[PDB]
C-alpha cells in the first residue's frame, strides 16, 4: 500500500484554505503526514500530485482581477520554496458599472502532474484569494498525492 | 522504474511551444524520449497522459477568439495523427471598444487521461496560439506521461 493523500478544505474555516485530513472521502495513510497545511512525503519516488480550488467571487472591480493556484515543493536540504504547478485565471470580463450591484461568479482551477520527490519534502497547495474559496458543497476543494 | 516524462516549455523560446527535457523539476527516463517536440513511448502498456498550457493574452478583438489545447497520438503503424485529449476555450468576453487600449487576460487549460499506447507511439501536446504562451514563471506549461 503506497503513500497516499487526498485532503479537502476546512468548511468551518475562515477566509482560509485549511487542509482537512479526516473526513469521509479523503486519505492520509502509508506515511504521508499533514503538517502546517503541507503534505509531507515519507519516502522518495515518483508521485502524482494534483489539486483543485473552486472560487466563487462577486463583482468585477476590474478586468485585472486575478485568481492564482499553485503547488510548491520545499526540499529538506535546500529548504527553499519552488513552484511545481501553477495557473492564473482572470475571471472578469467586464466591470460592474456602479449603482450596479455585484453578481456572483464561479471559476475552478485544476493542477496536476508527476514529480520525483525526496523523503521529507513538503508540498503546499496555495491560492491568492481564500476569501473567495467556495466549499459550501463537498468535492469542490482538494489536495492530493499518490506514490507510484 | 517505469517509463516517465514531465517536460516543460522552453522559456527562451520564440512565440513557440518547445518542450524542454532537462530542467530542475522535470523527467525524461526509463525509455521515454523527446523527439521532434514529441514524447516517444518505449514499451506498450497503460499510460496516464496529461498537460497544461497557460495563455496570457491581450485585448479582445472578438468573442470568437479561441484557445485550443490538444494531445495527439501517432501510431508507428497507421502513422496518422489522432486526438486523444482536446479542449477549447473562449477567453472573450466583450470586445475592446477602440480608442480603448487592450487589457491582459489569463486562461489555463488542463488535459489528462489514461490510454493504451504502443511501442514507438509518438505523442504531442499542441496549442493553436503559441504567441500567447505564458512561461514567465515555472510550473505554468508542461507535458507528461507515466506508465502504470
Amino acid at each position: 500500500d503506497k503513500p497516499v493523500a487526498h485532503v479537502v478544505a476546512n468548511p468551518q474555516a475562515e477566509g482560509q484554505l485549511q487542509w482537512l485530513n479526516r473526513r469521509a472521502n479523503a486519505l492520509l495513510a502509508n506515511g504521508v503526514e499533514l503538517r502546517d497545511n503541507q503534505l509531507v512525503v515519507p519516502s522518495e519516488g515518483l508521485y502524482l500530485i494534483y489539486s483543485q480550488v473552486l472560487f466563487k467571487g462577486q463583482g468585477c472591480p476590474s478586468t485585472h482581477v486575478l485568481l492564482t493556484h499553485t503547488i510548491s515543493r520545499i526540499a529538506v536540504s535546500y529548504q527553499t520554496k519552488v513552484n511545481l504547478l501553477s495557473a492564473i485565471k482572470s475571471p472578469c470580463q467586464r466591470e460592474t458599472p456602479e449603482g450596479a450591484e455585484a453578481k456572483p461568479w464561479y471559476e475552478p482551477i485544476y493542477l496536476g502532474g508527476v514529480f520525483q520527490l525526496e523523503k521529507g519534502d513538503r508540498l503546499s497547495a496555495e491560492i491568492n484569494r481564500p476569501d473567495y474559496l467556495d466549499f459550501a458543497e463537498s468535492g469542490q476543494v482538494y489536495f492530493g498525492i499518490i506514490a507510484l | 522504474d517505469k517509463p516517465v516524462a514531465h517536460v516543460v516549455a522552453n522559456p527562451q523560446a520564440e512565440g513557440q511551444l518547445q518542450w524542454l527535457n532537462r530542467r530542475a523539476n522535470a523527467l525524461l527516463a526509463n525509455g521515454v524520449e523527446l523527439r521532434d517536440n514529441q514524447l516517444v513511448v518505449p514499451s506498450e502498456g497503460l499510460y496516464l497522459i496529461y498537460s497544461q498550457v497557460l495563455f496570457k493574452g491581450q485585448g479582445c478583438p472578438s468573442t470568437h477568439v479561441l484557445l485550443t489545447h490538444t494531445i495527439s497520438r501517432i501510431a508507428v503503424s497507421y502513422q496518422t495523427k489522432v486526438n486523444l485529449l482536446s479542449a477549447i476555450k473562449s477567453p472573450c468576453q466583450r470586445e475592446t471598444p477602440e480608442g480603448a487600449e487592450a487589457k491582459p487576460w489569463y486562461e489555463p487549460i488542463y488535459l489528462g487521461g489514461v490510454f493504451q499506447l504502443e511501442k514507438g507511439d509518438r505523442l504531442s501536446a499542441e496549442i493553436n496560439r503559441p504567441d500567447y504562451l505564458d512561461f514567465a514563471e515555472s510550473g505554468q506549461v508542461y507535458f507528461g506521461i507515466i506508465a502504470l
Partner: antibody
C-alpha cells in the same frame, strides 16, 4: 460625497470592550462592502475587518490579529457598520477608519477616523 | 499576505519637477496595485487604481505604471499642494495590505 462618519472611540483598559459606529450616505449602502482600517505610527495602515453585502450572506472577514476578538456587523436599514471590539490590547491602539472597499479592490472612501487608546 | 516596500521613504523636489514614488511587492500582484494620498490631518485619498488608471477629479499630472512587482506613481510639475504621504496597496492577495508610505517634500 458619499460621506462616512465614524464614532465611539476613546480610552479603554486592556481587556475592555468598545463599540465603533459608522454611518454612510451617497451610495447604495446595502450593495457595498464596508471595512474598518486602522492606522498607527508604528504599524501604518492595517486592514481590520470586512462585512460584505446581504447577497453574500453577511460574509465577515477579520485580520489574523483580531480574529475572535472583534466582530463586524451592519444595519443596512440605518446605513451603518459597526466594530465591536473586546479583549482589547495595547497594540489595538490607533486611529480607526470606516471605509468602503469596492467589491474586492480599492478603498473607495474613508471616514475621518476615530481614535482608540487602550491603556490602564 | 503580500509585503509592499516603499523606498525611498522620503523624497524632496523643487516645484515644477517630476517626482517618482517606488512601490515593490515581495511577490507577483499582477496589476492590482493602488495609490493613495494622505494630507496632514486627513484620511487617505485614492489617486490611481490598478497600476495606471487615474480616478476622476484627480489632476492629470498624476500617473502610474508598473506590472508584476515593480510599480511607480509619478507626479510631474509638482506643486506644494502635493505635500503628503503616499501609500500603495495591493488587492491581488487576501488580506489586502499597504506599503509603509513615502513622504513628499516640495522644496522652496
Amino acid at each position: 460625497e458619499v460621506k462616512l462618519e465614524e464614532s465611539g472611540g476613546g480610552l479603554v483598559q486592556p481587556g475592555g470592550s468598545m463599540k465603533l459606529s459608522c454611518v454612510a450616505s451617497g451610495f447604495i449602502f446595502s450593495n457595498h462592502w464596508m471595512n474598518w482600517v486602522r492606522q498607527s505610527p508604528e504599524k501604518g495602515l492595517e486592514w481590520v475587518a470586512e462585512i460584505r453585502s446581504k447577497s453574500i450572506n453577511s460574509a465577515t472577514h477579520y485580520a489574523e490579529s483580531v480574529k475572535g476578538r472583534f466582530t463586524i456587523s451592519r444595519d443596512d436599514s440605518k446605513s451603518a457598520v459597526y466594530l465591536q471590539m473586546t479583549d482589547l490590547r495595547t497594540e489595538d491602539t490607533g486611529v480607526y477608519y470606516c471605509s468602503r472597499n469596492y467589491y474586492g479592490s480599492t478603498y473607495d472612501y474613508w471616514g475621518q477616523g476615530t481614535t482608540l487608546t487602550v491603556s490602564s | 499576505d503580500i509585503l509592499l516596500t516603499q523606498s525611498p521613504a522620503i523624497l524632496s523636489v523643487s516645484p515644477g519637477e517630476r517626482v517618482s514614488f517606488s512601490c515593490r511587492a515581495s511577490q507577483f500582484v499582477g496589476s492590482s496595485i493602488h495609490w493613495y494620498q494622505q494630507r496632514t490631518n486627513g484620511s487617505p485619498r485614492l489617486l490611481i487604481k490598478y497600476a495606471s488608471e487615474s480616478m476622476s477629479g484627480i489632476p492629470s499630472r498624476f500617473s502610474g505604471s508598473g506590472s508584476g512587482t515593480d510599480f511607480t506613481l509619478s507626479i510631474n510639475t509638482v506643486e506644494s499642494e502635493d505635500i503628503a504621504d503616499y501609500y500603495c496597496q495591493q488587492s491581488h492577495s487576501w488580506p489586502f495590505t499597504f506599503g509603509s508610505g513615502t513622504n513628499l517634500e516640495v522644496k522652496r
